[PDB]
Enzyme design. Structure first.
Site, PDB file in Angstrom:
ATOM      1  CD  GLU A 193      -2.904   1.011   2.394  1.00 25.82           C
ATOM      2  OE1 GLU A 193      -3.874   0.335   1.999  1.00 25.82           O
ATOM      3  OE2 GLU A 193      -2.836   1.479   3.549  1.00 25.82           O
TER       4      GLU A 193
ATOM      5  CE  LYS B  91      -0.978   3.605   5.412  1.00 26.15           C
ATOM      6  NZ  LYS B  91      -2.019   2.793   6.053  1.00 26.15           N
TER       7      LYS B  91
ATOM      8  CE  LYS C 295      -6.865   0.558   3.039  1.00 22.91           C
ATOM      9  NZ  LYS C 295      -6.445  -0.749   2.550  1.00 22.91           N
TER      10      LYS C 295
ATOM     11  CD  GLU D 238     -11.422  -2.300   6.339  1.00 22.40           C
ATOM     12  OE1 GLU D 238     -10.451  -2.243   5.554  1.00 22.40           O
ATOM     13  OE2 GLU D 238     -11.701  -1.389   7.145  1.00 22.40           O
TER      14      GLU D 238
ATOM     15  CG  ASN E 210      -8.818  -2.603   9.385  1.00 32.96           C
ATOM     16  OD1 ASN E 210      -7.714  -2.710   9.905  1.00 32.96           O
ATOM     17  ND2 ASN E 210      -9.317  -1.433   9.012  1.00 32.96           N
TER      18      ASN E 210
ATOM     19  CD  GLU F  80      -7.970  -4.307   4.902  1.00 33.25           C
ATOM     20  OE1 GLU F  80      -9.114  -4.671   5.231  1.00 33.25           O
ATOM     21  OE2 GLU F  80      -7.741  -3.218   4.334  1.00 33.25           O
ATOM     22  CB  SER F  81      -4.431  -2.684  10.093  1.00 31.67           C
ATOM     23  OG  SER F  81      -5.268  -1.986   9.190  1.00 31.67           O
TER      24      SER F  81
HETATM   25  O1  IGP Z   1      -0.460   0.821   7.434  1.00 35.89           O
HETATM   26  P1  IGP Z   1      -0.975  -0.441   7.904  1.00 35.89           P
HETATM   27  O2  IGP Z   1      -1.058  -0.523   9.364  1.00 35.89           O
HETATM   28  O3  IGP Z   1      -0.195  -1.532   7.289  1.00 35.89           O
HETATM   29  O4  IGP Z   1      -2.411  -0.542   7.423  1.00 35.89           O
HETATM   30  C1  IGP Z   1      -2.774  -0.705   6.210  1.00 35.89           C
HETATM   31  C2  IGP Z   1      -4.238  -0.557   5.802  1.00 35.89           C
HETATM   32  O5  IGP Z   1      -4.822  -1.882   5.621  1.00 35.89           O
HETATM   33  C3  IGP Z   1      -5.043   0.417   6.599  1.00 35.89           C
HETATM   34  O6  IGP Z   1      -4.633   1.434   5.651  1.00 35.89           O
HETATM   35  C4  IGP Z   1      -6.513   0.522   6.399  1.00 35.89           C
HETATM   36  C5  IGP Z   1      -7.309  -0.575   6.508  1.00 35.89           C
HETATM   37  N1  IGP Z   1      -8.581  -0.278   6.025  1.00 35.89           N
HETATM   38  C6  IGP Z   1      -8.605   1.048   5.620  1.00 35.89           C
HETATM   39  C7  IGP Z   1      -9.676   1.770   5.022  1.00 35.89           C
HETATM   40  C8  IGP Z   1      -9.449   3.101   4.725  1.00 35.89           C
HETATM   41  C9  IGP Z   1      -8.175   3.719   5.006  1.00 35.89           C
HETATM   42  C10 IGP Z   1      -7.120   2.988   5.592  1.00 35.89           C
HETATM   43  C11 IGP Z   1      -7.317   1.603   5.908  1.00 35.89           C
END
Ligand code: IGP
Length: 247
Positions: A50, A52, A109, A158, A179, A209-210
């Site tokens: 990703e 950002k 996203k 999600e 997530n 995710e995350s």
């Molecule tokens: O940076 P991380 O912790 O790896 O997370 C990624 C990502 O999945 C997280 O950006 C996120 C999960 N769902 C979202 C929906 C919108 C914006 C952001 C997100």
């Protein structure tokens, strides 16, 4: 959308008034969920890298989107590009430039609450979109899912809790993102994520995710049945880590 408070209420209001983007689409759609499945078949770890620049939880990195994407292209199963403008500093222009530079699947996203945003994703060059169960009502989610599918996209749906999963399953989601971070409180909960992953039907492509920053977390999640991993922050801070992750 659903009744929302705080920053989520704000970003959703911004999305409702997001101007549409008119452009001709060149490349056909490249299915991200099908590429994940073939990476699983060939036993290659599937990482969705990703991009950002900023994040409400603190990230602030300056890194060229094109160079980052072209580098990730050598290893990643696909890319996730933030197009949300106010909190993530993303833009449609960035998605457009990246889509013209790489040939792997691209997930757009953003906080999708209206059909024109999916039109935008398609016209910009994205191969699929994210739909977040927690900001949409069941009727909205079902319409948007059907709408994305009319462009031949299988959206990543999600979930963050059990109620999200019931809805996702009821509407026939085939590609689910679990997530670990609660979008509303920005709190991570690895344990709740593991519980949810274990409740999902084996025929659904699962994406964790995350908060993933270590190879061992990936190995553990993989044994729970996760098909792919969406990693952003750790890769934005250190692109080289992708080499450790795919071992
Ligand atoms: O940076 P991380 O912790 O790896 O997370 C990624 C990502 O999945 C997280 O950006 C996120 C999960 N769902 C979202 C929906 C919108 C914006 C952001 C997100």
């Amino acid at each position: 959308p659903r009744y929302l408070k705080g920053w989520l209420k704000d970003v959703v209001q911004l999305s409702l008034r997001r101007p549409s983007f008119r452009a001709s689409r060149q490349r056909p759609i490249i299915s991200l969920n099908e590429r994940i499945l073939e990476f699983n078949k060939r036993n290659i770890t599937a990482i969705i890298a990703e991009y950002k620049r900023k994040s409400p939880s603190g990230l602030d990195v300056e890194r060229d989107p094109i160079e980052y994407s072209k580098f990730m292209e050598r290893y990643a199963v696909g890319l996730s590009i933030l197009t949300e403008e106010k909190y993530f500093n993303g833009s449609y222009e960035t998605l457009r430039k990246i889509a013209s530079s790489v040939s792997i699947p691209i997930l757009m996203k953003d906080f999708i609450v209206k059909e024109s945003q999916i039109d935008d994703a398609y016209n910009l060059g994205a191969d699929t979109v994210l739909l977040i169960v927690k900001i949409l009502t069941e009727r909205e989610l079902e319409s948007l899912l059907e709408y994305a599918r009319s462009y031949g996209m299988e959206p990543l749906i999600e979930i963050n809790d059990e109620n999200d999963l019931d809805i996702a399953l009821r509407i026939g989601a085939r590609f689910i993102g679990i997530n670990s971070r609660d979008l509303e409180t920005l709190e991570i909960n690895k344990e709740n994520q593991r519980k949810l992953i274990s409740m999902i039907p084996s025929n659904v492509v699962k994406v964790a995710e995350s908060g993933i920053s270590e190879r061992n977390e990936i190995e553990e999640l993989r044994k729970l049945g996760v098909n792919a991993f969406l990693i952003g922050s750790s890769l934005m801070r250190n692109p080289e880590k992708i080499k450790e992750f795919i071992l």
